[PDB]
Amino acid sequence: EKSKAVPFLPRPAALDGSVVGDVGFDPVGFTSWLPLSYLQEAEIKHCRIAMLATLGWIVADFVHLPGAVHEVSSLAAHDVAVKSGALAQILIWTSIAEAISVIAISQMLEGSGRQPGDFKFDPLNFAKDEKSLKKMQLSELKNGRLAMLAFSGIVTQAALTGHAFPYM
Amino acid sequence: ERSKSLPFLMKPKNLDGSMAGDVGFDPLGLSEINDVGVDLYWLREAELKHCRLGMMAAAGILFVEILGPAPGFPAGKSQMDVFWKVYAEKPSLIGASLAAIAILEVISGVATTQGRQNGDRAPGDYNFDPLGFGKDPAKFKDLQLKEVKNGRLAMIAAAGMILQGVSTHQGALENLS
Numbered sequence: 254e255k256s257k258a259v260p261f262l263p264r265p266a267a268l269d270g271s272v273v274g275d276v277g278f279d280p281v282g283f284t285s286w287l288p289l290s291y292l293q294e295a296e297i298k299h300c301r302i303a304m305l306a307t308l309g310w311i312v313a314d315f316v317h318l319p320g321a322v323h324e325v326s327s328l329a330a331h332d333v334a335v336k337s338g339a340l341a342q343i344l345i346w347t348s349i350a351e352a353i354s355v356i357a358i359s360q361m362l363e364g365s366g367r368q369p370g371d372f373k374f375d376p377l378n379f380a381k382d383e384k385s386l387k388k389m390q391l392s393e394l395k396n397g398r399l400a401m402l403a404f405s406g407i408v409t410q411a412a413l414t415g416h417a418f419p420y421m
Numbered sequence: 422e423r424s425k426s427l428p429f430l431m432k433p434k435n436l437d438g439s440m441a442g443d444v445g446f447d448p449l450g451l452s453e454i455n456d457v458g459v460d461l462y463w464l465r466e467a468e469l470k471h472c473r474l475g476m477m478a479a480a481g482i483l484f485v486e487i488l489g490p491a492p493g494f495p496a497g498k499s500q501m502d503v504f505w506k507v508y509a510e511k512p513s514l515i516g517a518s519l520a521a522i523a524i525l526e527v528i529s530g531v532a533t534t535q536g537r538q539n540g541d542r543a544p545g546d547y548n549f550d551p552l553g554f555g556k557d558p559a560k561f562k563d564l565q566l567k568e569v570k571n572g573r574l575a576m577i578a579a580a581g582m583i584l585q586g587v588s589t590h591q592g593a594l595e596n597l598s
């Protein structure tokens with residue numbers, strides 16, 4: 254009762270405390286008719302994709318790969334990269350990763366034990382015990398949400414005003 | 422048995438004494454509506470939202486007309502017509518404000534319906550007391566009465582300002598003198 258985020262709204266009844274980044278924020282009750290693991294996986298995937306996208310947009314408006322095709326702004330880079338076939342390679346490998354993801358999310362939903370977003374990818378450690386893993390999961394979630402909103406703002410401002418890196 | 426405000430009318434059944442500003446002024450018996458998701462809880466929440474919105478709007482009109490606009494913002498003293506001058510030059514501000522108000526209003530409606538269902542939240546309550554001006558009781562009732570009276574007065578005032586600006590196309594205090 255009385256979820257932490259919205260103090261005047263009831264607790265979403267599906268997010269008690271046992272999830273990283275769980276401040277009880279679900280006013281429209283998306284968790285009431287969708288699996289929690291599915292939504293967590295979707296959120297983490299969005300976080301990672303948008304973090305990579307924000308970093309790439311900002312960097313590519315500064316540094317360009319050698320070649321005349323890579324001499325466009327990130328706003329206009331989509332139509333150039335799709336014509337050159339640059340985005341085709343990313344599409345192919347992302348589709349391979351996403352088919353393996355289809356298998357992984359299916360197994361997670363039907364038992365297994367794989368945590369949402371846990372691909373066990375960890376060449377370095379950066380997370381030795383449970384406490385470090387929880388803290389870094391919270392950091393990843395917060396940074397990913399911030400980067401999703403940041404990429405949203407960057408794209409909207411760049412489309413509104415065709416400016417360089419300062420999209421004001 | 423008779424309403425305090427209207428002695429020629431019987432006391433409205435649903436308005437005993439609880440809500441701040443209750444004087445029994447329900448001649449049409451609207452407090453007894455229990456259909457289309459509308460009841461005393463919904464009516465009180467709507468009244469409080471109207472009170473707060475009217476207070477904010479009246480304060481904004483008076484502030485802008487007396488102390489002038491903020492730097493970088495248009496002038497004209499007609500608040501119903503300066504809106505189109507702001508939108509003509511800063512449409513993004515208006516759009517962002519509208520989107521924020523839309524999200525907050527969706528949250529407000531969800532909260533109203535939930536609090537009506539599992540009764541734990543008083544109508545118009547959003548737990549918004551950052552400065553702790555209404556922590557203790559015996560002052561909360563007085564603050565509720567002050568808010569309700571000021572909000573009704575500002576509702577009437579803001580409706581008047583809207584109509585005056587739409588019709589006369591002049592400022593509020595311009596109409597005053």
Ligand code: CLA
Nearest residue numbers: 305306308309312313316317318323330334339346347350
């Ligand atoms: C969402 C991810 C994403 C997407 C869709 C793109 C898309 C694009 N980038 Mg880009 N970029 C990204 C992230 C991304 N970038 C990141 C994170 C960086 C920082 C290193 C850059 C740095 C960058 C530069 C410097 C340039 C581009 C350019 C371009 C355009 C054409 C060439 C190209 O594909 O990039 C080539 C990308 C690189 C050389 C660096 C990519 C490094 C990756 C993203 C990090 C490692 C992630 C890993 C491989 C994930 C594995 C995927 C899995 C399925 C196997 C194209 C529109 C070029 C352009 O035309 O600019 C307008 C260009 O000059 N990008």
Ligand SMILES: C/C(C=C=C1C(C)(C)C[C@H](O)C[C@@]1(C)O)=C/C=C/C(C)=C/C=C/C=C(C)/C=C/C=C(/C=C/[C@@]12O[C@]1(C)C[C@@H](O)CC2(C)C)CO
Nearest residue numbers: 500501502504505526527529530531532533534535583587
């Ligand atoms: C279904 C729903 C929402 C909901 C729900 C949920 C989501 C299901 C959740 C719950 O469970 C139930 C329920 C029902 O709550 C309904 C949504 C509400 C609506 C339909 C929104 C309406 C808002 C309209 C407003 C507030 C417009 C005001 C216009 C003004 C104009 C201003 C002007 O300046 C302009 C522009 C020109 C100037 O010249 C002069 C004037 C004219 C003054 C003043 O502001």
Ligand SMILES: CC(/C=C/C=C(C)/C=C/[C@@]12O[C@]1(C)C[C@@H](O)CC2(C)C)=C\C=C\C=C(C)\C=C\C=C(C)\C=C\[C@@]12O[C@]1(C)C[C@@H](O)CC2(C)C
Nearest residue numbers: 394395396398399402413512513514515516517518520521
């Ligand atoms: C800034 C913003 C969001 C900021 C979010 C932040 C900081 C989030 C922080 C967190 O996530 C972290 C970091 C960690 C989480 O655990 C906790 C929180 C705290 C939640 C959203 C802006 C959101 C801004 C929005 C939605 C603006 C919308 C504007 C519109 C629609 C206007 C459109 C128009 O103006 C045009 C474009 C042209 C005109 O011609 C037509 C019209 C329509 C007038």
